[PDB]
A = this chain, B = another copy of it.
Amino acid sequence: QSVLTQPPSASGTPGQRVTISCSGSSSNIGENSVTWYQHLSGTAPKLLIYEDNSRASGVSDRFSASKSGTSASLAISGLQPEDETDYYCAAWDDSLDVAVFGTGTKVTVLGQPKANPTVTLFPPSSEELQANKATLVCLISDFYPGAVTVAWKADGSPVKAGVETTKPSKQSNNKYAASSYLSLTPEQWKSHRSYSCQVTHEGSTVEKTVAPTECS
C-alpha cells in the first residue's frame, strides 16, 4: 500500500526554524518529484513546494525544501504563527503507478514550553481479572504539543491486536492527555514476563512497564 512516513508533530517557538521529514521509500522520494501541501481544516490544501525544492507562487521564502536520499524536508524557516497547519508530502510510487502521501505532521508554534508526557502504565484491575477480562492502560498525561505516539509490547515483542489509543485531549492545565489500552485475555496477560508501553512525543521516547505480579 505505501504512504510517506511523516512525523506526527514538528514544533518550535516563534522565529524558530522547523523541519518536516517525510520518509518515503527508495521508490518515491528515492527517485521521484516531491510535492508539498500545507492544509488548513475548512480550507482546500495549498501547493507549497512544487517539485522537491522548487517552490510555488504565493509560497514564501520561509518555506524551504530539500529532497534527499529516500527523504525530503520542508523547513518553515521563520516560524510565524499562521504556520500551524498540516503539511502533507506526496511523491510517486510504483505500488501501481501511484503517488503515495504522507501521514501528515502538525506544526504547533510553541506557545508554552515544550512538555514531554508522563506515562503511567497500569495492569489488570482485580475486579476485572475475576470477570475473565484483562485490560491495561497507558496514561499519557501532560504533553504539549498535542501529538504522542503509542506502541506496546509483550516480552519485547510488538503487539498489534486490540490496542486503541485516544486522540490527545487538551486538559485544564492546557496540556494534552491521551490513554491507550491493550485488552487481553487473563492468561495471555499472565503468559508473558512484562508488557511495555511506549510513547514517543517529539523526538523523545518513554518506555514504561509492568508485570503480572504474585497474588491474583
Contacts and interface: CB of A to CB of B under 8 A. Distances in A.
Interface of A: 1, 3-4, 8, 41-45, 47, 56-58, 86, 88, 96, 98-104, 120-123, 125-129, 133, 135, 137, 139, 141, 164, 166-167, 169, 171-172, 177-179, 181, 208-210, 213-216
A10 to B, nearest CB: 15
A44 B177 contact: no
A137 to B, nearest CB: 5
B135 A128 contact: no
19 contacts: A8-B42, A41-B104, A44-B101, A120-B181, A121-B125, A122-B122, A127-B210, A137-B137, A141-B164, A166-B166, A166-B177, A166-B179, A167-B167, A169-B169, A178-B179, A179-B179, A213-B215, A214-B215, A215-B216
A78 to B, nearest CB: 22
B213 A181 contact: no
A89 to B, nearest CB: 9
B121 A123 contact: no
B125 A216 contact: yes
A169 B171 contact: no
Contacts of A102: 44
Nearest to A46: B101
B104 A42 contact: yes
